RNA sequence: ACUAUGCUUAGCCAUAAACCUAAAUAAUUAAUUAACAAAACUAUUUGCCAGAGAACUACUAGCCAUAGCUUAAAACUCAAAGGAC
RNA sequence: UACUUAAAAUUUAAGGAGAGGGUAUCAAGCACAUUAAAAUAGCUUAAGACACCUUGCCUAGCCACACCCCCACGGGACUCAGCAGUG
């Protein structure tokens, strides 16, 4: 661009930073609604443990439960955080082990 | 260069043309109603002007032209 | 005989319109520095000026004097002088009529007409 | 039309000043060298020269803005006559509209440099010059209809104010 | 085999790989090989571009256009897509 | 604070050299002008008007707000956005 064209337009217009599943917040608290299994897109093979939750914001999201074995059930309360599960498409939240009803993984 | 990027547009345009063909009659009724709303918005915007200016009736000998109907 | 408050005590511009009665719309231009590029560009402003004799024509360069009291909402200047008349310029250096970069009347001659 | 059209008995521009000097020339020879036995292009060289004499201070010069404007006024009127018979000629319709625009550009430069010459040329050639409008105005059915009402609404409001002022003054006059 | 149609007279539509894929103008041919193509490269002015797909799409406004044209997004998905060899 | 008349601090009103967020799929706004016998048809706008949306900024500090109705005669759902404390 010429100096006249750079002057008339100025600095590049910057698209706004749209928020993610947590709405730009460190964590959210949600109530478990259902516990189900999700299959990792190919070429991965597993039965990943996930759950649906109603977050404090009022929306519903699918959250991956990390660790080997969880005791979560419906009506439980959990603290969700960010971080996508790469193999699981659409799962953009994770549960924090050791907070509210969700507990630390029992060590073997 | 290959025509791969043209083939994607070729399928997108072909599939879109058949979708418009399937729902052609539905689209016609959508349009006539979108134009009618487009006319009411035009009429109301003209009423807002004279009412704000303080007139209680539209200017004498004025009839809002129907510009979105099948006049041509 | 206190002078105006406005910063533009003296403004030069081009008469871009003359359709108002006894008023001339004038476009002035100043140089403003682009901070990113550090290059000067033209910022133009519009000034309404009192043309008492309606002696202004579109395209002529004029000098405006800030009025002590604003005549109206927008008329805060008067026409001091017409520096260059459109098509009727008179060379300041020699004093002879000119038509562009040329003398309509040679400076060697002394017509005194 | 225009005040002057060259007569059919007039000589072409090549021999316009040569035949008069020759002592005696036959009627036939005058007819061969007249404008009756010539193309339209020759009749246009005579129209232009007549206008240069009646307008330009120095008809010997054809590179002046006033002379260039005169050259384009003959062409513009020539293209217009062409287009009156050839209604669907799009190349000449382009030639007509492009010459008109060329004249406007030259008339603008003439006005900015020699206003006195500009005024004579427009009066003699009968060409009206309108100054370029500062702002371009868009046009479409919705705008032209809203802009018409807005002008009408204003006029009605102002007409009412004039009536009120007259009635108010009339009442005051009666009291006095 | 045969029609719309290609033709003529008016009006409409305004789209092409409308691409010579190379904007126009004035230079320069040494101080100069990403690859390929049609050698490199300076200045001036405007236009346009800012990962791929979604998308010659949705919505908006304009238009003689009504299964249309121009204008032209986002959500969402991916860690590539793409060019030349 | 001085003088029977002048030095400050602190505000208010009218303004303007220049600078000052986003969307142009917000492209027209619709009285937004001048003259001063009261006429003229003008004013802003792709050098971004108007519209809508978002945000305190200018940081020795400044600006706005003070239960709500922009205001607070009036009306209402009737007062901790002073310190501590509570739901
Ligand atoms: K694997
Ligand atoms: K080609
Ligand atoms: K308030
Ligand atoms: Mg090939
Ligand atoms: Mg496709
Ligand atoms: Mg046939
Ligand atoms: Mg045909
Ligand atoms: Mg195209
Ligand atoms: Mg071709
Ligand atoms: Mg297309
Ligand atoms: Mg479309
Ligand atoms: Mg559309
Ligand atoms: Mg839109
Ligand atoms: Mg409170
Ligand atoms: Mg209050
Ligand atoms: Mg407190
Ligand atoms: Mg209080």
From Swiss-Prot, chain A:
Q: Where in the cell is it found?
A: Mitochondrion
* First and last residue of the signal peptide: none
Q: Report the domain of life of the source organism.
A: Eukaryota
GO cellular component, alphabetical, reads:
mitochondrial inner membrane; mitochondrial small ribosomal subunit; mitochondrion
Main localization is mitochondrion
Q: Does the keyword Ion transport apply?
A: no
The family line of this record is:
Belongs to the universal ribosomal protein uS12 family.
Q: How does the annotation summarize its subunit structure?
A: Component of the mitochondrial ribosome small subunit (28S) which comprises a 12S rRNA and about 30 distinct proteins.
Q: What is this protein called?
A: Small ribosomal subunit protein uS12m
Source organism phylogeny: Eukaryota, Metazoa, Chordata, Craniata, Vertebrata
From Swiss-Prot, chain B:
Identify the tissues in which this protein is expressed: Ubiquitously expressed and especially highly expressed in heart, skeletal muscle and testis.
**Location(s), subcellular:** Mitochondrion matrix; Nucleus
Which family does the record claim for this protein?
Belongs to the mitochondrion-specific ribosomal protein mS38 family.
Q: Please give the subunit comment from the record.
A: Component of the mitochondrial ribosome small subunit (28S) which comprises a 12S rRNA and about 30 distinct proteins. Interacts with Aurora-A.
Function, as annotated, reads:
May act as a negative regulator of Aurora-A kinase, by down-regulation through proteasome-dependent degradation.
Q: How is this protein named in the record?
A: Small ribosomal subunit protein mS38
Q: Which organism is it from?
A: Mus musculus
Q: What is the lineage of its organism?
A: Eukaryota, Metazoa, Chordata, Craniata, Vertebrata
Residues shown, of full length: 129 to 200 of 200
Curated annotation (Swiss-Prot), chain C:
Compartments, as annotated in UniProt: Mitochondrion
Give any GO molecular function from the UniProt entry.
Answer: structural constituent of ribosome
- Membrane-spanning regions, if any? none
Source organism superkingdom: Eukaryota
Q: Which InterPro entries match?
A: NA-bd_OB-fold (IPR012340), Ribosomal_uS17 (IPR000266), Ribosomal_uS17m_metazoa (IPR039193)
What keywords appear on the UniProt entry? Mitochondrion, Ribonucleoprotein, Ribosomal protein, RNA-binding, rRNA-binding, Transit peptide
Q: Which residues form a coiled coil?
A: none
**One BP annotation, GO:** mitochondrial translation
Query: Which cellular components does GO assign to this protein?
Result: mitochondrial inner membrane; mitochondrial small ribosomal subunit; mitochondrion
Task: Using the UniProt entry, state which stretch of residues is the transit peptide.
Answer: 1-18
Q: Which Pfam families match?
A: Ribosomal_S17 (PF00366)
**Which PANTHER family did the record assign?**
28S RIBOSOMAL PROTEIN S17, MITOCHONDRIAL (PTHR24088), SMALL RIBOSOMAL SUBUNIT PROTEIN US17M (PTHR24088:SF0)
**Subunit details:** Component of the mitochondrial ribosome small subunit (28S) which comprises a 12S rRNA and about 30 distinct proteins.
The similarity annotation says: Belongs to the universal ribosomal protein uS17 family.
Name this polypeptide is given = Small ribosomal subunit protein uS17m
Q: Which organism is it from?
A: Mus musculus (Mouse)
Curated annotation (Swiss-Prot), chain D:
Which keywords describe this protein according to UniProt?
Answer: Mitochondrion, Ribonucleoprotein, Ribosomal protein, Transit peptide
Main location group: mitochondrion
- In Gene Ontology terms, what is a biological process of this protein? mitochondrial translation
Compartment annotation: Mitochondrion matrix
Gene Ontology, cellular component aspect: mitochondrial inner membrane; mitochondrial ribosome; mitochondrial small ribosomal subunit; mitochondrion; nucleolus; nucleoplasm
Kindly indicate whether the keyword Transit peptide belongs to this entry: yes
Q: Which GO terms describe its molecular function?
A: structural constituent of ribosome
For this chain, the family text in UniProt reads: Belongs to the universal ribosomal protein uS15 family.
Question: Quaternary structure per UniProt?
Answer: Component of the mitochondrial ribosome small subunit (28S) which comprises a 12S rRNA and about 30 distinct proteins. Interacts with METTL17.
This protein is called: Small ribosomal subunit protein uS15m
* Biological source species: Mus musculus
Q: What's the encoding gene here? A: Mrps15
